[PDB]
Scaffold this active site. Structure first.
Site, PDB file in Angstrom:
ATOM      1  N   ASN A   1       8.313 -42.558 -54.546  1.00  0.00           N
ATOM      2  CA  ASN A   1       9.101 -43.209 -55.589  1.00  0.00           C
ATOM      3  C   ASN A   1      10.540 -43.514 -55.166  1.00  0.00           C
ATOM      4  O   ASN A   1      10.908 -43.378 -54.004  1.00  0.00           O
ATOM      5  CB  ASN A   1       9.102 -42.338 -56.847  1.00  0.00           C
ATOM      6  CG  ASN A   1       9.922 -41.075 -56.675  1.00  0.00           C
ATOM      7  OD1 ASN A   1       9.778 -40.353 -55.681  1.00  0.00           O
ATOM      8  ND2 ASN A   1      10.789 -40.798 -57.643  1.00  0.00           N
TER       9      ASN A   1
ATOM     10  N   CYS B   1      13.236 -41.888 -55.674  1.00  0.00           N
ATOM     11  CA  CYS B   1      13.942 -40.715 -55.156  1.00  0.00           C
ATOM     12  C   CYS B   1      13.181 -39.864 -54.144  1.00  0.00           C
ATOM     13  O   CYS B   1      13.581 -38.739 -53.845  1.00  0.00           O
ATOM     14  CB  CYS B   1      14.415 -39.845 -56.318  1.00  0.00           C
ATOM     15  SG  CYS B   1      15.537 -40.743 -57.407  1.00  0.00           S
TER      16      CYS B   1
ATOM     17  N   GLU C   1      10.439 -38.069 -54.196  1.00  0.00           N
ATOM     18  CA  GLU C   1       9.908 -36.754 -54.527  1.00  0.00           C
ATOM     19  C   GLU C   1       8.471 -36.862 -55.039  1.00  0.00           C
ATOM     20  O   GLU C   1       7.668 -35.947 -54.861  1.00  0.00           O
ATOM     21  CB  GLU C   1      10.804 -36.035 -55.553  1.00  0.00           C
ATOM     22  CG  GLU C   1      10.515 -36.289 -57.033  1.00  0.00           C
ATOM     23  CD  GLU C   1      11.263 -37.485 -57.602  1.00  0.00           C
ATOM     24  OE1 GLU C   1      11.460 -37.532 -58.842  1.00  0.00           O
ATOM     25  OE2 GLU C   1      11.642 -38.381 -56.816  1.00  0.00           O
TER      26      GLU C   1
HETATM   27  N1  LIG Z   1      19.658 -42.292 -66.978  1.00  0.00           N
HETATM   28  C1  LIG Z   1      18.669 -42.257 -66.037  1.00  0.00           C
HETATM   29  C2  LIG Z   1      18.692 -41.245 -65.045  1.00  0.00           C
HETATM   30  C3  LIG Z   1      17.664 -41.225 -64.082  1.00  0.00           C
HETATM   31  N2  LIG Z   1      16.642 -42.162 -64.079  1.00  0.00           N
HETATM   32  C4  LIG Z   1      15.518 -42.171 -63.046  1.00  0.00           C
HETATM   33  O1  LIG Z   1      15.105 -40.854 -62.588  1.00  0.00           O
HETATM   34  C5  LIG Z   1      15.162 -40.779 -61.137  1.00  0.00           C
HETATM   35  C6  LIG Z   1      15.905 -39.558 -60.606  1.00  0.00           C
HETATM   36  O2  LIG Z   1      16.331 -38.700 -61.644  1.00  0.00           O
HETATM   37  P1  LIG Z   1      17.320 -37.481 -61.353  1.00  0.00           P
HETATM   38  O3  LIG Z   1      18.702 -37.886 -60.764  1.00  0.00           O
HETATM   39  O4  LIG Z   1      16.572 -36.424 -60.601  1.00  0.00           O
HETATM   40  O5  LIG Z   1      17.426 -36.799 -62.819  1.00  0.00           O
HETATM   41  P2  LIG Z   1      18.273 -37.091 -64.157  1.00  0.00           P
HETATM   42  O6  LIG Z   1      19.191 -38.294 -64.058  1.00  0.00           O
HETATM   43  O7  LIG Z   1      17.192 -37.148 -65.211  1.00  0.00           O
HETATM   44  O8  LIG Z   1      19.155 -35.884 -64.197  1.00  0.00           O
HETATM   45  C7  LIG Z   1      15.677 -42.085 -60.600  1.00  0.00           C
HETATM   46  O9  LIG Z   1      14.685 -42.603 -59.697  1.00  0.00           O
HETATM   47  C8  LIG Z   1      15.928 -42.977 -61.804  1.00  0.00           C
HETATM   48  F1  LIG Z   1      15.145 -44.164 -61.681  1.00  0.00           F
HETATM   49  F2  LIG Z   1      17.186 -43.388 -61.813  1.00  0.00           F
HETATM   50  C9  LIG Z   1      16.647 -43.186 -65.110  1.00  0.00           C
HETATM   51  O10 LIG Z   1      15.732 -44.059 -65.143  1.00  0.00           O
HETATM   52  N3  LIG Z   1      17.659 -43.194 -66.048  1.00  0.00           N
END
Ligand SMILES: Nc1ccn([C@@H]2O[C@H](COP(=O)(O)OP(=O)(O)O)[C@@H](O)C2(F)F)c(=O)n1
Ligand SMILES: Nc1ncnc2c1ncn2[C@@H]1O[C@H](COP(=O)(O)OP(=O)(O)NP(=O)(O)O)[C@@H](O)[C@H]1O
Ligand SMILES: Nc1ncnc2c1ncn2[C@@H]1O[C@H](COP(=O)(O)OP(=O)(O)NP(=O)(O)O)[C@@H](O)[C@H]1O
Ligand SMILES: Nc1ccn([C@@H]2O[C@H](COP(=O)(O)OP(=O)(O)O)[C@@H](O)C2(F)F)c(=O)n1
Ligand SMILES: [Mg+2]
Ligand SMILES: [Mg+2]
Lengths: 648, 648
Positions: B337, B339, B341
């Site tokens: 994906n 990120c 993971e």
């Molecule tokens: N406000 C947000 C925050 C994160 N994400 C999605 O979750 C993924 C990574 O989440 P993360 O950094 O681990 O976790 P949080 O923002 O949920 O803390 C990205 O690929 C993403 F597409 F960026 C999203 O879609 N919207």
């Protein structure tokens, strides 16, 4: 290269792409079997000497993009290409193919480029354009529409797309606090797809035209889509903006009154009605404060600045198009096409198709008397027009449709579009100034006969195969023909009572038949001037063939001429040793009254089912000048007020 | 603002967009009725004083983008948002909601942003990312895929897209003499759509990740997609390139041998197989001269230059991912994906979904002895992990799916992804250097328990609701768990014999459960360091809370410190009056052995169903250094060799 036609077909049909080892036939199975089963009759029908009926540049155009090639080498001779097209059109009806072959090879008429390319080949996409409707004001409707446009772009043909139903900038979106980005960002998505679906080969880069009614709130950025100095990311350099104008806008402008900008979502139905009904619905929405009111002339001024700078947006009148269309029983027509000549109905499940062909007007000139003088054979013109009408009819049936919406549309209404070329050449051969009283009459007569002939042949087809599906309830079914909708009496060279009688009786196979197109390339192949417009210039270097002859027959043609012409932009006015009679005959489109251009255009319009690509040429383009040209065409009742605006 | 929860729900539910007069509820019908039917129980359950459990920046993050607003005004208190999420997840199971509310409000764990945003709202799209498969190597497949991506983009969530099956530049196209434009022009179409479907509000601009195997002929331009000095129109500034690398590539590079570039059309099936089967098929295609051979190291060098400059492309190992996935019975996994993971199966009719949540590791630290010292409560951690597992399970069922492919995928395999945050904080509180032997053991234990717990709860769910549809035939159904696929014995803190026994007996409700994510924003809300990585810096200005305390307890904390820290990039090494014990404990990620980072990452990987976002930090980035880090991670058997490559 090879001479025997059946042999060239063999090579084209057995062709294999060496670098890939993939069989890659350039001729359909059916057309191949038809050639093989009549090789003797077809081979001995071709007159190879007719290949010399093409000027240098004419032939070069054919060789460069039309004649089929084998591994980069021209495999077809002009005659081969013509018989291929003839067969591709008529199939098993060999007698019909032979007729089209001779008439085409003799230059009486020709078909549009897509047809010359693809007729007789595996994916015979013979149509010139498609009018596509934006499916829905949704991410899903927008992307389904994008997908449809991309599939259409895979092959030949231009696209006309109306987007009146898309939410304007800042508009509310349920389910999120964000707001609509508006038209521009969406237009830019389409621009990008037009650049990606590049490899059609046959295809021309962008070639997308966008239609929008002037009350849409994003109207100001829309009309400036082609400026080469904008805010950079608000432009759509490869797409063409076209205005779908209601009479109401023109009246408010003329009245120096107000005009209200609406987001379609806060003022529904505006593009789903026209005329009085539109004005009542518009005025009502206006009073309820659903939009942003402005000074009509403010929008108007921006329109002229945009046209003066970019040549766009084109101007096509919504009410004139709908009020005077035989397809008015289908619903409201929401757009025209890339070249502003097609006026056909479209919807989410129906993409209107352009089936084009142009008659070579000069081919009907003849002495037929004693010589010196010469007359026009309308009887022959009529005869050929019927031939072409039958051809475009076959094309509808043998055509390959890129998308289902296009097939559904064409099979249901069977619209056709005959056009012309060599009008200017015609007047010149007959020694008639373009702005003369004689040329005006000839213009009317020619179009009256082509219209009568197309409707007559279409009526015969209806007797043989039945009327098109939606014929009942159409103006034509009630005896209302195009000129009746202009409240005029036909010129009369032909008998309309009988034709109209037969139509009401047996109907017609085609819902529409006329739409004089630009013929930018096909006219180059026959060696005549484009469509129905005056010559732009009298000048590898090639001086007007007719002007040459005359300057020679006076001896006055030396060198002080060849040098003059190139310098004065192919103009001979204000030139010392040239008879007035020649100055009057060889005037340039920049030297002819734009008002006379618009009158003749209005004259022939009473015989045009759809519309015609009316370019406007202004030498000294002032605002007030351009303004009176628009209002003059508008009051003249024109459908296409203006295609391109060329300046100099 | 208002305090009573039921009242805030009322306001959020009755909300009307004034400027439009449109009712615009911010709470679902079902969750609203559940709050109203238990207002007394729910209102008196909330401990509003827990709102003080958030640091300044923590609270600000919530207020800025999480707490629901009414006309631009914050309407929710942190406790309101938590109960909304609890209810949005558990529905009518009030006892479950109360538990999640207390545990979340006490900071034992939290859910991903999409869940905090949308849980309990009308369009509850609670998932974090989607893994989309390019539907087909056709204009139709490409535009159906574009449409799918746009619809997904309408709401929250990132996209991972593999494009191994798309025809390379210059490739042959049947039906035309043009040739394929390749990946770049197509990528640019996707870039443009990512910028257009902007107004998700919740949504983050581009957020698209592209996956490509290194043998694709357009590989060289693909990896340079983020350079800010390219040929301008060959870049895709808003998208992230990710390499899906087969072991074969790494071996050829290591052997300084050759590597062949193939267009998928001239070498079919390469992405539809992995391991030995891929190598046999690849080698065979290579010998038959179907592609363009090059020096493996030539591609390798470009990869490192690209990562060194842009931080991309990410590196995820195709064979390690497929060989060690419990979803291997579904078919070949073609990507990860955004990120790096998530490692889940995807296909034209199945778009894998990311259901995320992270456990707050520091919340399990406790003195529980006599004081001064402190121990870790694995029993509690285990307990909470089971709670979160049940939550992510409910989410799968109550989730709103943007597209059908996502619903189909999630309902069939029910993948889950538990993660962590505060690892660094944990080690710091326990006074354990990140690179110590104690920290290494704790890392192993923590992940062993979270894995055992997630599988145990998932097994209980399988007993209650049945195994997921595709459980039979999976490694887990044959008693093969994640660490078995790494050919290792579990650490042993928990009993695996019994769990494995029960799984083979009753199955598990989820096909996957672990995938430590970045937690970039959610970790900011709880006030801990991101996921599983060391602190990047010990420095509104905020010096490391733990470093502060210690520097104070030594009095040595004056001003010659606050000034030092800001200047030396939150580093305290080479600092005069600071005990070695503190330098060892507060090392920065730039000061920790990247080899130790990769070992601990490999240690915890035996307990990770999917993978984990392993950023790599190189202070002095030389080619050879970056090279040994990649090969060290690769030989370590890692799935995600590298997420972002950060330098300084
Ligand atoms: N406000 C947000 C925050 C994160 N994400 C999605 O979750 C993924 C990574 O989440 P993360 O950094 O681990 O976790 P949080 O923002 O949920 O803390 C990205 O690929 C993403 F597409 F960026 C999203 O879609 N919207
Ligand atoms: N996330 C988005 N990004 C950009 N434009 C959007 C977005 N969502 C909607 N739009 C615009 O809004 C219209 C599409 O809305 P659509 O997705 O069909 O409706 P919806 O999400 O159901 N909301 P609504 O139409 O208010 O009921 C089009 O004119 C789009 O260009
Ligand atoms: N007109 C075009 N412009 C740009 N790319 C094209 C075009 N036609 C095809 N392609 C590319 O070729 C592939 C799509 O071919 P597609 O339209 O499915 O096949 P087709 O027209 O039936 N030809 P073929 O796939 O050879 O049988 C994709 O990788 C496209 O990006
Ligand atoms: N090679 C060509 C030539 C023309 N056309 C399409 O036909 C339309 C106008 O055709 P035209 O100028 O009147 O006629 P020809 O090229 O057929 O002579 C344009 O909208 C078009 F989209 F440009 C096309 O699709 N391909
Ligand atoms: Mg909608
Ligand atoms: Mg194909």
């Amino acid at each position: 290269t090879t001479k025997q036609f059946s042999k060239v077909v063999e090579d084209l049909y057995r062709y294999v792409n060496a670098a890939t080892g993939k069989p890659a036939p350039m001729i359909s199975d059916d057309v191949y079997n038809i050639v093989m089963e009549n090789k003797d009759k077809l081979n001995s029908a071709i007159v190879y000497d007719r290949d010399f009926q093409y000027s240098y540049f004419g032939f070069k155009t054919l060789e460069r993009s039309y004649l089929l090639r084998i591994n980069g080498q021209v495999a077809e001779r002009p005659q081969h290409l013509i018989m291929r097209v003839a067969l591709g059109i008529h199939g098993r009806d060999i007698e019909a193919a032979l007729e089209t072959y001779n008439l085409m090879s003799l230059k009486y008429f020709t078909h549009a480029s897509p047809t010359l390319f693809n007729a007789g080949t595996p994916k015979p996409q013979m149509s010139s354009c498609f009018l596509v409707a934006m499916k829905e004001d949704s991410i899903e409707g927008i992307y389904d529409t994008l997908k449809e446009c991309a599939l259409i772009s895979k092959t030949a043909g231009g696209i006309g797309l109306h987007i009146h139903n898309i939410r304007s900038t800042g508009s509310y979106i349920a389910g999120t606090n964000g707001t609509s980005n508006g038209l521009i960002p969406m237009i830019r998505v389409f621009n990008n797809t037009a650049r990606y679906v590049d490899q059609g080969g046959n295809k021309r880069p962008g070639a997308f035209a966008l239609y929008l009614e002037p009350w849409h709130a994003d109207i100001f950025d829309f009309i400036d889509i082609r400026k080469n100095h904008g805010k950079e990311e608000i432009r759509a350099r490869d797409l063409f903006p076209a205005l779908w104008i209601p009479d109401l806008f023109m009246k408010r402008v003329e009245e120096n009154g107000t005009w209200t900008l609406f987001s379609p979502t806060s003022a529904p139905g505006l593009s789903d009605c026209y005329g009085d009904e539109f004005e009542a619905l518009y005025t009502r929405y206006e009073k309820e404060g659903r939009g942003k009111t402005i000074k009509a002339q403010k929008l108007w001024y921006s329109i002229l600045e945009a046209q003066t700078e970019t040549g766009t947006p084109f101007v096509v009148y919504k009410d004139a198009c709908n009020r005077k269309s035989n397809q008015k029983n289908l619903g409201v027509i929401k757009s025209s096409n890339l070249c502003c000549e097609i006026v056909e109905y479209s919807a989410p499940d129906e993409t209107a198709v352009c089936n084009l062909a142009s008659v070579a007007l000069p081919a009907f000139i003849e002495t037929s008397e004693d010589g010196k003088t010469s007359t026009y054979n309308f009887k022959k013109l009529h005869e050929i027009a019927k031939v072409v009408t039958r051809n475009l009819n076959r094309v509808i049936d043998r055509n390959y449709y890129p998308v289902e919406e296009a097939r559904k549309s064409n099979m249901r209404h069977r619209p056709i579009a005959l056009g012309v070329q060599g009008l200017a050449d015609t007047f010149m051969l007959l020694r008639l100034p373009f702005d003369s009283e004689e040329a005006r009459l000839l213009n009317i007569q020619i179009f009256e006969t082509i219209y009568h002939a197309s409707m007559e042949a279409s009526c015969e087809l209806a007797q043989k195969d039945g009327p098109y599906e939606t014929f009942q309830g159409s103006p034509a079914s009630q005896g209302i023909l195009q000129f009746d909708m202009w409240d005029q009496k036909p010129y009369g060279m032909w008998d309309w009572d009988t034709l109209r009688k037969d139509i009401m009786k047996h109907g017609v196979r085609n819902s529409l038949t006329m739409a004089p197109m630009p013929t930018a390339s096909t006219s180059q192949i026959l060696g005549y001037n484009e469509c129905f417009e005056p010559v732009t210039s009298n000048m590898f270097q090639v001086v007007n063939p007719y002007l040459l002859r005359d300057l020679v027959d006076l001896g006055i043609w030396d060198e002080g001429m060849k040098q003059y012409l190139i310098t004065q932009n192919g103009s001979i006015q204000g030139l010392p040793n040239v008879p007035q009679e020649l100055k009057d005959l060889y005037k340039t489109v920049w030297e002819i009254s734009q008002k006379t251009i618009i009158n003749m255009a209005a004259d022939r319009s009473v015989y045009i089912d759809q519309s015609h690509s009316l370019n406007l040429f202004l030498r000294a383009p002032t605002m007030g000048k351009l303004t009176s040209m628009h209002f003059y065409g508008w009051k003249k009742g024109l459908k296409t007020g203006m295609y391109y605006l060329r300046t100099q």
